[PDB]
Nucleic acid binder design. Structure first.
Ligand code: MG
Ligand code: MG
Lengths: 740, 740, 482
RNA sequence: ACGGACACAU
RNA sequence: AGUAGUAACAAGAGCAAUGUGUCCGUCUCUGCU
């Protein structure tokens, strides 16, 4: 009842050394004296186990084995022996005693293993009922990123889950801190009701709860899906040259499917506009695309996902549009106006150079969901007017932080205090608009006194909010008011009817241009579930790193066919649909200026004989997959958007993107070998070149018998029969003549 | 035909077969005998690279200290220690300018961590030099001896349990004119061995109280014990490592915590990242460096190491760095963080074991210790040791040698990283305004430096500028271990980048094998190591299946658990054969019970009990996972909790004995501490789960808990009033004893 | 420090610093670099713990005797199959030893094998056995407190190793170790059933890998080393005071699937009170051979070779009567050497992970599994050797066996010379690769790199062979650029 | 949280 | 003698740092087909 431990403490206190230790050691010093060890350290346990298992008794167990396991086997083995001491509570045990217990010990009716290790049985249930597709062989472009190896609880973070575990298992030891969430409280009451009358040790209960509730992450090289059920089978699903198609056993997660529907929508939308019919291609790809081995159009008829590119895929089919987008989890529904996106290089509050994406153009908003409402008048970097509503008085105060992050003026971008790294510890680019969100939730005093005040007229139906938390009726902040009733429901939460056209601009029965394809967010996220665009319009796995390698891999094996199309009737070659998903990597204003340069380079390779570089026709060819312009400008590199970072591709020589390797006789793209082009080096390696400059011929290396040096942009005022020395790029000079 | 493996490098690139250059299947080189020669070598070299500095005698320790700081600038390419304090301050000022708010954020995190760090953080270490014993001890043992000696001498600030009060006691103990410590002495006695009939020496260790002087205590408090690093790959000759005592370790902890907070937020630091995160960071650095370049630019990468990194660093430079990083901070914090460079500027190095001397007439050998080597006549050494002893004699004090320059191996890794990052940070193109600029990444001494320039001579001028700035701050680039090539391939700490990081599987080969804990733990480790190398180190699927088979073969040998139908015979073949014959479902027996191997590629992440659970016999499952398992430890709630683990989770017996050495007198205290910590956990259940905090003694905590537990049990009706009165009177008897 | 402002101090000290502090880039051209300078002296001698290509087995096919599987019972069963014994004579002396002691050791061992009972044969401690096992050779360890009176206390010597010249025997050993035998040496344990298609692909590739890798001679050396180091560790820990006899056993399966137990000779353990990890236990190795040591005498420097018998040898035409020699030496091993010898089967990983990676690299390019093209289409497409006709190209299974033999010989001849040489010559290999990529390599001290390489080439025959291999690869690379 | 193993740098 | 290699073992006290990352866990015998 608790009498035995106080009698034992009396017995120990009657010893003098024990009493001095128990009276002089504090609870903090007990952590030090608990790990006190005065013997020699045991090293090398592998070697020690190798030779200790040759002995008869390598195992030390408690003395109760003398009552549970006999001293003699049926075969005559000795199972345990008493130690060299006399009153030791410890015996030396043979592994034959372990085998005796496993074959002839007491059978128990109560086993605890499927409950304590329920996580691993969940894993085995996911594997056993899983399905295997084929194996495809291609160059896997893995990217090292942080993923979840244990998903944890959705309502908890790791520290909140550890505090829930302490409140459940050891409730009288939690100390000063309380549980600061209602989710913590519901999980705590549920786990306390679940774990009543448990004869398991509390530490094993705590570790079982940590396997259930605590989210663990690791940096792993992932090629495909990144949800926690595709990460446990990462050794099975991917390798260096192969992909095993695997669907785990069981029902998928909802928030995982909601995310990967958006990523698959944006790929099909961005692929479609560089087709000659952007609607007929989007319908051809939506009906064949599958997510976690489930078709797309059956997901697009039951999902409440409110996103811009999802709405193109539904308005093409016929599913009704719930027109809104989501920042922070709230429905940010537009009303009126129109904008367009184009990024820029702006400065932030912590003196860091940031590449933000700001929506330039007027947009009227009705932002409302589940706790409040807001009618945000807003244009270009200007929170003009927001009559914000609510239900409780405090829930308006947190949503006040929500709208003022989305505003992005020249006030909130320079009213940031603290340390807000938009990169991570691996120099990985975090998206900026959600980093100001999680920062201003608790640091809000810089967003209330830098925002200032604006004068208003005493009209009824309007309240106010001050910087210092005062509800007011004379003054308030700039562009933010407070209403009472707000805007009612069943107009944001109605899925309205719309119609689509050939170029995917989505307009309703009145004619509101609700979605244009130019308003699609051109980001490449990594999906939680795999996506099989089983179509002849895409490649095997999408991704900007994969579109680069697979396009050049296809030109290299089809080079015997494509070189003949290049030699005669070349405009049939440029119009290939294999070349079309490569154009999603080029920015929009750069497409016609690159094909006009490239085809002008390609025509000078034809009118000048002997200047046939098959390694440079390959490199420039998927930049001609567009109707050209007549803009006679000079380029030394072509930029390519991959994960936000514009990779350059040099017209002359290797790069980090297109590297030809003379040693292996191969073209290396992004570190992936994409095959030997033709192996025609002896016909190649010429002197005169024609596909580097526009209207100019490189004539060998540098020579100063013609005058000074120029650069690539300063060749505009030249004449006939005039040669020069030009910095061509990558630290070298060539003799260059503007021809006839 | 003579067979040459290296000719495979004709066809395969060297990075794609780099695993054939690591001979990591044989044993690594170990050191035999003493480490005194490598200690003397490093003392001689540290004073050789600084020899043109100033010599002074310390007023407190009496040692000869060499000051190379602001010394004469070097005139050749030898390793130099003449770091210029103004250039170090300029580089740290430039690091603060390029990162505004970095030093203040890192100092604030260190200030918050100083106030909440306990003394027992210092028990996180491995083998620590114990100044009370003049010997290495484990870290918790060394801290307990230091706290015991301090509180015996009247330094009771560390009774609060915070680390900073222990550090105040460390600084206050230097004023003590006579320290009184407890030392381990021995008592020898000539007995006759009973099993070989040879007269041996019985060593019996006891405790003894001695009186240290003030200078002897100060020399011991600045003493770094030294030894040779064993099992080091890649080197022909051995080097020495050092361990500091307990008076240095808390200050070194706080300084390295500040420098870790700085290094986390630097994009050019390779610490504290590692693994996939470090490779992601290096690939991001390569891509950003090619992003911050125009097309008329060469780019070259140095694969760099530094010559004698730890010997050419300086604690006075670290003092200037720490004071400039913490500029504008509280002066207690600047004085606390300055203690570790001041203590490393005045350190001595204990020389080691000494040397083994041999007598050919008497046919004997004796170990002459490091403290007796100053009295040995010089004719008794060999030639290299004679030269070492003669040029170290003016540094020798109390068995140690004075070592004022140099830090030691690994003492300040992050602070040295910050210095290298400051030199890397100098090369931004807006700072330099040259025709060149550089960038890169820097670990402890390894760097990858990317120099961009318009011509190859600008690359040379940039390399010269980087090299000479590094020479100004004491950093010496290794000219024989470094090289330069164009950007696209490099090496960083045995990571090989050939347009992307290749796999180096040989590096992981010492982890494939039987680990030696017990049967279940080794099975888990073996499958997990195979799976982790499938994911990260590109272990192919056929080689992973072969690895599973090789692990199961070595496992079945090691625990003598071959299959139940085998023809082999061991000590446990008969009982495993009985268990095999009596079992209906043989496919559910564990491999440690003669069962079949269940593992293939797909189920490598599932433990063996979970994998076989639906195939076990209910008798075998009830015996194997019996909750009355006599091989594991049972926690008392007599009555104990149920077990969860199987019978294969036994513990192997230990052997902490030393040959001919009785040491019961020094092993009493560990048993008494274990008994006190066992009786504490009867009152505080979560002590083994979370470390309990507290400043009250263990006995007061136990009596308070017993009183409130008896009162809550009497309120809840779970005990009677007589039991409550008996518990309260037992507590009053314990308090009557505790008063005396 | 708190009031410091920079005023161009770095540029002032860079103006003041001498111009002899510079990092001048020397352009690297492998066509103009020199070969590594191999040392001179006497030839390198054999130093493996057992005989590799000269060893002889006495075998029993399908052993069914009593107590089968016990090592001394199998050793008696294998000695029963040889009746051509005679009186042993020293035909090649160990020049630093007492060779009559080795003769008496062999006669004592054979006499005690003839009349042993039990499972473990422990030889009596006679004077020749105490000599050959180094008993009494240590000076008596004393404390210095009772040793100050001793007036001739001289420090232990720390001489460097003496340089040896590369001989041709270690290349012959490496050529023999890359060859297929007529037996399976590695018995791989069972696997779970294949459910995934990738497991079918992996099993199909693993069957090719096992068919090439298990009949190799290096796999026999793996199993020999694993058995020897295992039995030596178990004997060294359980029989610390006995002079135990450990037979050198292996167990193979032939091309017909029949079991076979092979005996290579015996090992007599000394006393093993191993406290450090580098503490040496001494043993005597006595190994059967059909190789006359008087041809390559310098290889057998540490051995006393006896002639103990005659054997009918059936050649391709008819039958001769060859002498049977017994190679006897003292050798020694530590616990870490035994530990790393018991795990030589991970050499099988280091080979195969390389070969599979090559198979996988082509599989990323051809977009299909190229396992059966690599093993069935018998193309010669990897340089693995240098004949007098030039560079010889082998199949991928030959590459399997050559890389396997390289890992096995790294494990057998593991030294600090090897560790230093590999880490230092890796830089020169990467520089040659950077030249062949047209990445314009450059050095800062190439002469210092060469002196860092060549100080690691002292006397180990494997290191001298690897340095000669690097010289041959450099000549091949310079000829490919001719 | 603590411990063990392995890798790398010093 | 031998192992070995800058100093040792060849019995008679067994000397394992710092930093980072990854992985696992929670107290008289020798036989690998
Ligand atoms: Mg270095
Ligand atoms: Mg280094």
């Amino acid at each position: 009842s608790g009498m035995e431990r106080i009698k034992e403490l009396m017995e120990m206190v009657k010893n003098s050394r024990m009493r001095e230790i128990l009276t002089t050691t504090s609870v903090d010093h007990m952590a030090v004296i608990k790990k006190y060890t005065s013997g020699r350290q045991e090293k090398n346990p592998a070697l020690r186990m190798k030779w200790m298992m040759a002995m008869k008794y390598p195992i030390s167990a408690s003395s109760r084995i003398r009552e549970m396991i006999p001293e003699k086997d049926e075969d005559g083995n000795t199972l345990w022996t008493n130690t060299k001491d006399a009153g030791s509570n410890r015996v030396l045990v043979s592994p034959n005693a372990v085998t005796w217990w496993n074959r002839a010990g007491p059978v128990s009716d109560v086993v605890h293993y499927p409950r304590v290790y329920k996580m691993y049985f969940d894993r085995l249930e996911r594997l056993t009922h899983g399905t295997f597709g084929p194996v495809k062989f291609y160059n896997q472009v893995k990217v090292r990123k942080r993923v979840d190896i244990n998903p944890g609880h959705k309502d908890l973070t790791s520290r909140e889950a550890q505090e829930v575990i302490m409140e459940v298992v050891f409730p009288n030891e939690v100390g000063a801190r309380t549980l600061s969430s209602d989710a913590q409280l519901t999980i705590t009451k549920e786990k306390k009701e679940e774990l009543k009358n448990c004869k398991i040790s509390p530490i094993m209960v705590a570790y079982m709860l940590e396997r259930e509730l605590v989210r663990r992450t690791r940096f792993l090289p992932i090629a495909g899906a990144t949800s926690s059920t595709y990460v446990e089978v990462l050794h099975l699903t991917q390798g260096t040259c192969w992909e095993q198609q695997y669907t785990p056993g069981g029902e998928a997660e909802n928030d995982d499917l909601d995310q990967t529907l958006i990523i698959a929508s944006r790929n099909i939308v961005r692929r479609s506009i560089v087709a000659i019919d952007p609607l007929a291609s989007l319908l051809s790809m939506c009906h064949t695309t599958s997510i976690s081995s489930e078709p797309l159009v059956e997901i697009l008829r039951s999902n409440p996902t409110d996103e811009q590119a999802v709405n193109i895929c539904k308005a093409a089919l016929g599913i009704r549009i719930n027109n809104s987008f989501s920042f922070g989890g709230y429905n940010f529904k537009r009303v009126k106006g129109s904008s367009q996106r184009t990024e820029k290089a702006v400065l932030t509050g912590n003196l860091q150079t940031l590449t933000m994406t700001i929506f330039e153009g007027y947009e009227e908003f009705n932002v409302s969901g589940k706790r409040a409402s807001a009618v945000l008048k807003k244009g270009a970097q200007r929170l003009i007017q927001a009559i914000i509503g609510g239900r409780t008085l405090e829930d308006i105060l947190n949503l006040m932080i929500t709208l003022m992050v989305f505003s992005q003026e020249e006030k909130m971008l320079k009213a940031v205090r603290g340390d807000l790294n938009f990169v991570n510890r691996a120099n990985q680019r975090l998206n900026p608009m959600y980093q100001l969100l999680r920062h201003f939730q608790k640091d809000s005093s810089t967003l209330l006194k830098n925002w200032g005040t604006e004068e208003i007229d005493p009209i009824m139906g309007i309240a106010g909010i001050m910087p210092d938390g005062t509800i007011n009726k004379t003054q308030t902040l700039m562009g933010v008011r407070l209403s009472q009733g707000g805007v009612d429901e069943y107009s944001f939460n109605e899925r309205i009817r719309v119609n689509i056209d050939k170029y995917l601009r989505v307009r309703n029965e009145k004619g509101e241009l609700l979605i244009s394809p130019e308003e699609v967010s051109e980001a490449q996220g990594q999906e939680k579930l795999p996506i099989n665009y089983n179509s002849s319009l895409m490649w095997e796995v999408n991704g900007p790193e994969s579109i680069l390698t697979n396009t050049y891999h296809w030109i290299i094996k089809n080079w015997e066919l494509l070189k003949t199309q290049w030699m005669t009737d070349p405009t049939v070659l440029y119009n290939r649909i294999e070349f079309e998903p490569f154009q999603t990597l080029i920015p929009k204003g750069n497409r016609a200026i690159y094909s006009g340069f490239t085809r002008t380079l390609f025509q000078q390779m034809r009118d000048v004989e002997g200047t046939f570089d098959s390694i440079q026709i390959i490199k420039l060819l998927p930049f001609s997959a567009h109707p050209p312009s007549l803009g006679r400008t000079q380029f030394s590199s072509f930029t390519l958007n991959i994960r936000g970072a514009p990779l350059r591709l040099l017209i002359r020589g290797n790069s980090q993107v297109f590297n030809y390797n003379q040693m292996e006789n191969v073209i290396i793209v992004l570190g992936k070998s994409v095959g030997s082009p033709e192996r025609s080096i002896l016909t190649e390696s010429s002197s005169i070149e024609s596909a580097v400059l526009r209207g100019f011929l490189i004539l060998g290396k540098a020579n100063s018998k013609y005058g000074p040096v120029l650069t690539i942009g300063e060749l505009d005022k030249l004449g006939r029969g005039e040669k020069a020395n030009v910095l061509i790029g990558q630290g070298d000079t060539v003799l260059v003549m503007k021809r006839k | 035909m003579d067979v040459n493996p290296m000719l495979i490098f004709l066809k395969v690139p060297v990075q794609n077969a780099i695993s054939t250059t690591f001979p990591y299947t044989g044993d690594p080189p170990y050191s035999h005998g003493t480490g005194t020669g490598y200690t003397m070598d490093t003392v001689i070299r540290t004073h050789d690279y600084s020899s043109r500095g100033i010599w002074k005698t310390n007023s407190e320790t009496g040692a000869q200290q060499l000051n190379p700081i602001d010394g004469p600038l070097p005139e050749d390419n030898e390793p130099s220690g003449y770091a210029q304090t103004d250039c170090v301050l300029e580089l740290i000022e430039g690091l603060d300018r390029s990162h505004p708010g970095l030093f203040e954020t890192a100092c604030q995190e260190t200030i918050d961590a100083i106030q909440q760090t306990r003394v027992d953080k210092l028990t996180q270490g491995r083998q620590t030099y114990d100044w009370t014993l003049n010997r290495n001890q484990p870290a918790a043992t060394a801290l307990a001896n230091t706290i015991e000696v301090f509180r015996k001498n009247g330094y009771k600030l560390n009774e609060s349990g915070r680390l900073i009060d222990f550090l105040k006691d460390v600084l206050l103990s230097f004023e003590n004119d006579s320290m009184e410590v407890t030392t381990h002495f021995q008592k020898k006695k000539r007995i006759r061995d009973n099993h070989s009939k040879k007269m041996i020496t019985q060593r019996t260790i006891g405790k003894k109280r001695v009186k240290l002087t003030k200078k002897n205590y100060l020399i011991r408090a600045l003493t770094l014990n030294t030894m040779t690093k064993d099992a080091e790959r890649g080197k022909l000759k051995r080097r020495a490592i050092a361990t500091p005592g307990m008076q240095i370790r808390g200050f070194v902890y706080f300084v390295e915590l500040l420098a870790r907070n700085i290094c986390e937020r630097l994009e050019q630091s390779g610490l504290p990242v590692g693994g996939n995160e470090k490779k992601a960071k290096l690939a991001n650095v390569i891509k950003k460096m090619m992003a911050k370049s125009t097309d008329e630019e060469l780019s070259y990468t140095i694969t760099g190491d530094n010559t004698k990194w730890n010997e050419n660093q300086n604690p006075r430079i670290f003092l200037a760095m720490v004071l400039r990083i913490t500029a504008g901070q509280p002066e207690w914090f600047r004085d606390l963080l300055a203690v570790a460079p001041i203590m490393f500027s005045n350190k001595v190095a204990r020389l080691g074991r000494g040397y083994m001397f041999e007598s050919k007439s008497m046919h004997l050998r004796t170990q002459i210790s490091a403290e007796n080597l100053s009295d040995i006549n010089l004719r008794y050494f060999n030639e290299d040791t004679k030269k070492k002893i003669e040029k170290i004699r003016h540094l020798m004090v109390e068995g140690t040698a004075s070592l004022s320059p140099g830090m030691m191996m690994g003492m300040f890794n992050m602070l040295s990283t910050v210095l290298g990052v400051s030199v890397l940070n100098l090369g931004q193109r807006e700072i330099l305004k040259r025709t060149y600029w550089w960038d890169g990444l820097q670990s402890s001494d390894d760097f990858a430096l990317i120099i961009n320039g318009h011509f190859k001579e600008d690359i040379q001028q940039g390399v010269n500028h980087f090299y000479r700035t590094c020479k100004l701050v004491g950093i010496n680039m290794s000219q024989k271990k470094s090289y330069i090539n164009k950007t696209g391939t490099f090496e960083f700490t045995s990571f090989f980048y050939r347009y992307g990081f290749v796999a180096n599987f040989s590096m992981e080969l010492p982890s494939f094998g039987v680990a030696g804990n017990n049967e279940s733990a080794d099975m888990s480790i073996g499958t997990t190591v195979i799976k982790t190398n499938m994911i990260n180190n590109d272990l192919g699927p056929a080689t992973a299946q072969m690895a599973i088979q090789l692990f199961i073969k070595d496992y079945r040998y090691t625990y003598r658990c071959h299959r139940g139908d085998t023809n082999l015979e061991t000590r446990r073949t008969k009982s495993i054969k009985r268990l095999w014959t009596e079992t209906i479902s043989k496919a559910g027996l564990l491999v440690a019970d003669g069962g079949p191997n269940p593992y293939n590629l797909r189920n490598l992440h599932i433990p063996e009990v979970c994998l076989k659970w639906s195939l076990m016999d209910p008798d075998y499952r009830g015996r194997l996972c019996n909750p009355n398992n006599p091989f594991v430890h049972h926690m008392e709630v007599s009555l104990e909790y149920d077990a969860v683990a199987t019978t294969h989770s036994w513990t192997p017996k230990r052997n902490r004995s030393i040959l001919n050495t009785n040491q019961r007198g020094i092993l009493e205290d560990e048993r008494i501490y274990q008994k006190c910590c066992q009786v504490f956990e009867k009152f505080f259940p979560s002590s083994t789960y979370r470390r309990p905090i507290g400043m009250a003694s263990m006995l007061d905590a136990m009596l308070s808990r017993a009183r409130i537990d008896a009162r809550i049990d009497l309120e809840s009706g779970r005990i009677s009033s007589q039991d409550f009165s008996e518990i309260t009177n037992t507590c009053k008897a314990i308090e009557a004893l505790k008063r005396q | 420090v708190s009031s410091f402002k920079a005023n161009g101090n770095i540029e002032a000290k860079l103006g003041a610093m001498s111009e002899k502090v510079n990092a001048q880039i020397e352009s690297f051209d492998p066509r103009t670099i020199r070969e590594l300078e191999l040392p001179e002296g006497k030839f390198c001698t054999q130093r493996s713990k057992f005989l590799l290509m000269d060893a002889m087995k006495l075998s029993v096919l399908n052993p069914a005797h009593e107590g089968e599987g016990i090592p001394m019972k199998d050793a008696k069963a294998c000695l029963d199959t040889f009746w051509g014994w005679k009186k042993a004579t020293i035909i090649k002396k160990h020049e630093k030893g007492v060779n009559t002691n080795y003769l008496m050791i062999w006669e004592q061992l054979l006499e005690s094998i003839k009349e042993m009972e039990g499972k473990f044969l422990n030889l009596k401690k006679t004077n020749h056995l105490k000599w050959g096992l180094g008993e009494g050779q240590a000076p008596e360890k004393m404390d210095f407190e009772d040793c100050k009176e001793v007036p001739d206390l001289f420090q232990y010597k720390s001489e460097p190793p003496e340089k040896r010249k590369l001989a041709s025997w270690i290349q012959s050993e490496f050529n023999k170790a890359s060859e297929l035998t007529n037996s399976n040496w590695i018995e791989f344990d069972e696997l779970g059933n294949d459910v995934a298609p990738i497991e079918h692909i992996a099993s199909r590739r693993r069957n090719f890998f096992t068919a090439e890798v298990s009949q190799c001679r290096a796999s026999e050396y793996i199993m020999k080393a694993v058995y020897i180091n295992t039995a030596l560790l178990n004997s060294s820990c359980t029989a610390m005071e006995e002079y135990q006899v450990i037979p050198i056993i292996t167990k193979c399966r032939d091309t017909s699937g029949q079991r076979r137990t092979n005996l290579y000779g015996f090992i007599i353990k000394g006393r093993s009170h191993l406290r450090n990890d580098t503490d040496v236990v001494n043993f005597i190795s006595l190994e059967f051979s059909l190789t006359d040591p008087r041809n390559e005498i310098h290889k057998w420097e540490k051995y006393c070779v006896l002639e103990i018998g005659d054997m009918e040898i059936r050649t391709s035409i008819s039958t001769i009567m060859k002498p049977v020699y017994l190679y006897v030496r003292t050798n020694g091993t530590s616990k870490i050497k035994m530990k790393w010898g018991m795990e030589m089967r991970r050499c099988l990983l280091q080979s195969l992970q390389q070969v599979e990676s090559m198979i996988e690299a082509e599989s990323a390019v051809k977009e299909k599994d190229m396992t059966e093209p690599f093993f069935r289409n018998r193309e010669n497409d990897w340089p693995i050797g240098e004949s007098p006709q030039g560079i010889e190209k082998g199949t991928i299974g030959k590459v399997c066996r050559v890389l396997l033999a390289k890992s096995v010989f790294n494990s057998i001849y593991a030294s600090a010379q090897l560790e230093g040489f590999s880490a230092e010559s890796r830089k020169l290999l990467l520089l040659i690769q950077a030249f062949r990529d047209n990445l314009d390599p450059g050095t800062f001290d190439l002469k210092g790199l060469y002196e860092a390489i060549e100080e690691c080439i002292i006397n180990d025959p494997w290191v001298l062979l690897n340095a000669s291999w690097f010289n041959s690869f450099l000549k091949a690379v310079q000829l490919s650029m001719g």
